[PDB]
């Protein structure tokens, strides 16, 4: 359950808050009744309210209107800048930080014990979140061959078997795996190839890929509030 | 006493400096002298709702619920006192025939 | 509330208007300002006289709250019901609550049961039964001679008749016996009183009139229902509502007033002889028994009273009036009452 | 209930007027009839009217012509000018002037305590009618915030919120706000752009209102008469 709270503003009057919510000035009377409010019900100061504290409100006192409020359904627009940031992070999951150092393992892309987790250096487990929890995510599973992963079979990719030939036949086998591997994770709303080269040994190409937009993520964690749960069982 | 307050937004509130002799402020605050003594009347009005409170008509009234008149030149203070006792009349007794006596 | 009135509000509005502003100088008959004012002082006097009457009836309402008197709601008329058999009975018979009585009589359609099983012994000849109109309200009061149907069936039974007109049946309390009887409530808080004592002994709705009859260390009850009768089940309540009122260590009684049974038969002449018929008997008949079945305690029945009550019927339509079985007032004790016995009237 | 009263012209007939209302000469013994007359129905002159003032009507004499009629279905050729504009002057009502002094509210449009009450100059209260009532309502409604009004949400405009950047994107937005704050009035029937500019700072646009016709307005006003309100609840 949840419901509405209005702090009093300054010489507001029950209709016009009735008018504001409700829609109509005539619920003034629910409303008193509801908070139990005597006649004098929006005094001008506190000394007026020490006359009875309990049955009176004065200016910045809250009160309560009785009406299931849900948080989906909400104008996007209304919402913060930084709500917005907080929203989309937890969208996109806090995960405990295992691609530091990036050069090591981008060394030794194809072998296994590359990565290991990190210290946030405030002597707390170390932490990516948003971006840069997609980032560990989407490099981790290229990075994992296919069938590895123990509970998992389809988790990876079999990118660690395309060490073929300079043809643009393996490029074409490289590029499809690619966008399998990508297109395998949910929050990938798709992905795409953008340019790619061949140097003799080294290939090279480039990727783009479009996460979940704001107002999608904004929406799964609101309807999420029905639940409580706000993690990700993906 | 809300009659500014729930008033038509545009429409000025103080008396303007332009004008000493501003028509619009006066007919406001003759509604709302108006209205704030309807307001002080009907708070003033609970005194009449309890016996205790109560004055000359509405006690004559609850006199008359009682079963007790008011007596010429009797005054509310002394008419309330009398109901009350009526109300809390011991009989049957020596001491209660010596107090009626 | 000052009980203001519209020509002070109006006035006092227009006052101030005028000191506000010296532009504003048009107040006639008809002028906008004039006639916004007007509305606005006509609502604050309803506003006035709607809060007047709201605070009285808000009093009353108090009244009844505080000391839990609530108003007394429409009785159910009851009366008892005569039964006679072919010869004396062998079998004792049972006769279980809810055995209907009913009436051929058409202009009286009401129908009566009993609240309570009767047994009638054997080598009996008739039996007398309470009975409780099912509808609520004054319809119950039927005259005499009216019930002559019983619903149980029973081959035994030989005629069915109440001999008495039934008059308990009433409808919703007025407020005037409200206020009295609150009246009574407050003479009766202090419990050893006469007044007291009459209080609780009328402290049973069913309860019409009681008369006390006082004497050295000895006090007599005189009590009657609205018909005129005392049952035993009625003492016993009010002796039972008398225990929290009465003083203690006198001695008590209670006991049926002295009721008198005025049967009347009356010839009456009429002017207009195409007038005769069932309707004009049965309406004078009507009047007659309304007339004693209002007498109260200790009334004594006046012949010429009752010869005014049946002439002004209709002073030109009724020519002469003659009683055949009346020839001198009666008086009445203090603890005595007059009913209606058969109620008879001949056309001519 | 309603009739027509027909004034007897020189040397006039009881045919011809039969003839002329009825359509049909036969109805003149029903107009002798209705109107007790007697053999000589209209005489020339007073002095013969003298003999028997009750039964005879002479020249200048008013007659009832016992025929429902109805204010409404009445061709607006026939009605005078000053009646047409008493007719649309009642459509369009009458209001207490509040828009006087056009240059301080026009100086502080957004703010409150902008418009106030005047006087006639005959010591009563000032009165707008017609265009000048209509001038007032719609510069009323354009300068009241939407919802700030008690008793009624939708009334008012969101132009105190419209004071945005200088781009093409705010002057549509506030032409449609413009447009639709127009049309909520019920007798505007339509409005809608003329030309705009911006000058940096200042916006500058025009509009064209086009009210009810002289037609509609005498049709609702004739057929009013029916109710005998005469007033307007829109």
Known sequence: MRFKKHVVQHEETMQAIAQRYYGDVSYWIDLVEHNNLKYPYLVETDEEKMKDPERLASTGDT???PIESDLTDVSAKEINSRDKDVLVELALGRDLNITADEKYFNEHGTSDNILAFSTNGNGDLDTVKGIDNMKQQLQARLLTPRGSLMLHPNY???????????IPEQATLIEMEVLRTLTSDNRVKSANLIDWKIQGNVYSGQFSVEIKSVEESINFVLGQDEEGIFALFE | ANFLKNLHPLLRRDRNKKDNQDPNFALIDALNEEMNQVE???IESKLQSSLKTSTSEYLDKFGDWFGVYRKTDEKDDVYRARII????????????????? | MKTRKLTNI?????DKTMAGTSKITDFTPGSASRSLLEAVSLEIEQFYILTKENIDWGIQEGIIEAFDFQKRQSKRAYGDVTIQFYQPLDMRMYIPAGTTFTSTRQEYPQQFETLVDYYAEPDSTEIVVEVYCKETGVAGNVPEGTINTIASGSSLIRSVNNEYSFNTGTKEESQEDFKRRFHSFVESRGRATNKSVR??????PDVEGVYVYEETGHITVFAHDRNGNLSD??????????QDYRPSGIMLDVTGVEKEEVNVSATVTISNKSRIGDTLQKHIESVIRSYLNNLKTSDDLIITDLIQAIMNIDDVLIYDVSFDNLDENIIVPPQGIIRAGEIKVELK
Request: proline content about 0%; overall charge neutral.
């Open chain 2, 40 to 42: 002080k009347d009907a």
């Open chain 3, 10 to 14: 109006l006035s006092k509005l227009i």
């Open chain 2, 85 to 101: 006792k009526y109300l809390l009349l011991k009989r049957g007794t020596n001491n209660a025939i010596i107090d009626a006596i």
């Open chain 1, 63 to 65: 009160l309560i209107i």
């Open chain 3, 199 to 204: 209080y609780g002994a009328l402290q049973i």
């Open chain 1, 156 to 166: 990876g990719s079999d990118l660690h078997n395309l060490f073929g030939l300079n």
């Open chain 3, 233 to 242: 089940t009625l003492k016993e309540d009010i002796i039972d509502a008398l």
